[PDB]
Amino acid sequence: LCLVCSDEASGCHYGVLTCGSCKVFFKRAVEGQHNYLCAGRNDCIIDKIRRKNCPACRYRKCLQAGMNLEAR
Ligand SMILES: [Zn+2]
Ligand SMILES: [Zn+2]
């Protein structure tokens, strides 16, 4: 299971057991430019449904999980 947006995970990538999308998301969200906002809220729960409400919390969530694009 995806330990970010709490969905059926395809396989682990980077540092943690994530879905298919959280992989690609994270690699953009780290080594790229981002425009996700929960920089001064950080309220919403990111799961299988509510992740469409906010892709900002997902970055925070995956990081708490232990994601690292230079993990092992
Ligand atoms: Zn996910
Ligand atoms: Zn949010």
mmCIF file of C-alpha atoms and ligand atoms in Angstrom:
data_model
loop_
_atom_site.group_PDB
_atom_site.id
_atom_site.type_symbol
_atom_site.label_atom_id
_atom_site.label_comp_id
_atom_site.label_asym_id
_atom_site.label_seq_id
_atom_site.Cartn_x
_atom_site.Cartn_y
_atom_site.Cartn_z
ATOM 1 C CA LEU A 1 0.000 0.000 0.000
ATOM 2 C CA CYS A 2 0.948 3.632 -0.853
ATOM 3 C CA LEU A 3 1.951 5.190 2.433
ATOM 4 C CA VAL A 4 1.145 8.651 1.194
ATOM 5 C CA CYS A 5 -2.177 8.733 -0.605
ATOM 6 C CA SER A 6 -3.190 5.408 1.011
ATOM 7 C CA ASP A 7 -3.967 3.568 -2.195
ATOM 8 C CA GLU A 8 -2.930 0.134 -3.548
ATOM 9 C CA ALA A 9 0.854 0.449 -4.114
ATOM 10 C CA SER A 10 2.445 -0.953 -7.260
ATOM 11 C CA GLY A 11 5.868 -1.309 -5.651
ATOM 12 C CA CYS A 12 8.319 0.713 -3.535
ATOM 13 C CA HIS A 13 10.564 3.344 -5.115
ATOM 14 C CA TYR A 14 13.037 5.829 -3.654
ATOM 15 C CA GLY A 15 12.811 5.348 0.118
ATOM 16 C CA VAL A 16 9.247 4.049 0.707
ATOM 17 C CA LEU A 17 6.356 1.829 -0.400
ATOM 18 C CA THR A 18 4.388 4.230 -2.605
ATOM 19 C CA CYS A 19 1.959 3.954 -5.499
ATOM 20 C CA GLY A 20 2.773 4.388 -9.224
ATOM 21 C CA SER A 21 1.997 8.126 -9.234
ATOM 22 C CA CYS A 22 3.768 9.069 -5.911
ATOM 23 C CA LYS A 23 7.044 7.974 -7.513
ATOM 24 C CA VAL A 24 6.796 10.366 -10.504
ATOM 25 C CA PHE A 25 5.196 13.048 -8.311
ATOM 26 C CA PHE A 26 8.076 13.028 -5.865
ATOM 27 C CA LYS A 27 10.839 13.072 -8.529
ATOM 28 C CA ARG A 28 9.185 16.238 -10.021
ATOM 29 C CA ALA A 29 8.434 17.663 -6.551
ATOM 30 C CA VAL A 30 12.071 17.392 -5.443
ATOM 31 C CA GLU A 31 14.261 18.020 -8.494
ATOM 32 C CA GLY A 32 11.969 20.433 -10.271
ATOM 33 C CA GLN A 33 9.661 23.416 -9.744
ATOM 34 C CA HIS A 34 6.413 23.012 -7.796
ATOM 35 C CA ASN A 35 3.253 25.033 -7.107
ATOM 36 C CA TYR A 36 1.414 23.124 -4.353
ATOM 37 C CA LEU A 37 -0.027 25.104 -1.425
ATOM 38 C CA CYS A 38 -0.155 23.954 2.211
ATOM 39 C CA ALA A 39 2.730 26.186 3.174
ATOM 40 C CA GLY A 40 0.605 27.881 5.830
ATOM 41 C CA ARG A 41 -2.400 25.566 6.259
ATOM 42 C CA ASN A 42 -1.408 21.875 6.404
ATOM 43 C CA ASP A 43 -4.928 20.742 7.288
ATOM 44 C CA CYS A 44 -6.129 18.299 4.637
ATOM 45 C CA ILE A 45 -5.761 14.498 4.846
ATOM 46 C CA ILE A 46 -4.307 12.925 1.718
ATOM 47 C CA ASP A 47 -5.688 9.498 0.929
ATOM 48 C CA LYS A 48 -7.313 7.573 -1.963
ATOM 49 C CA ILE A 49 -9.999 10.246 -2.494
ATOM 50 C CA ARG A 50 -8.903 13.499 -0.868
ATOM 51 C CA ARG A 51 -5.600 13.697 -2.772
ATOM 52 C CA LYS A 52 -7.504 15.497 -5.606
ATOM 53 C CA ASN A 53 -8.203 18.314 -3.119
ATOM 54 C CA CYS A 54 -4.512 18.992 -2.522
ATOM 55 C CA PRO A 55 -1.199 17.670 -4.009
ATOM 56 C CA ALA A 56 0.806 19.739 -1.385
ATOM 57 C CA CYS A 57 0.126 17.607 1.722
ATOM 58 C CA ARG A 58 1.160 14.523 -0.286
ATOM 59 C CA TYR A 59 4.707 15.938 -0.558
ATOM 60 C CA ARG A 60 4.762 16.495 3.235
ATOM 61 C CA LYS A 61 3.210 13.054 3.858
ATOM 62 C CA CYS A 62 5.615 11.054 1.668
ATOM 63 C CA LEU A 63 8.557 12.890 3.326
ATOM 64 C CA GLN A 64 7.257 11.905 6.821
ATOM 65 C CA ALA A 65 7.028 8.318 5.505
ATOM 66 C CA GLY A 66 10.761 8.393 4.756
ATOM 67 C CA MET A 67 10.851 9.059 0.966
ATOM 68 C CA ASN A 68 14.199 10.083 -0.501
ATOM 69 C CA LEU A 69 15.220 10.161 -4.159
ATOM 70 C CA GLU A 70 18.693 9.308 -2.882
ATOM 71 C CA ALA A 71 17.554 6.622 -0.436
ATOM 72 C CA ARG A 72 18.625 2.951 -0.701
HETATM 73 ZN ZN ZN B 1 0.273 7.575 -3.826
HETATM 74 ZN ZN ZN B 2 -3.252 20.319 1.989
#
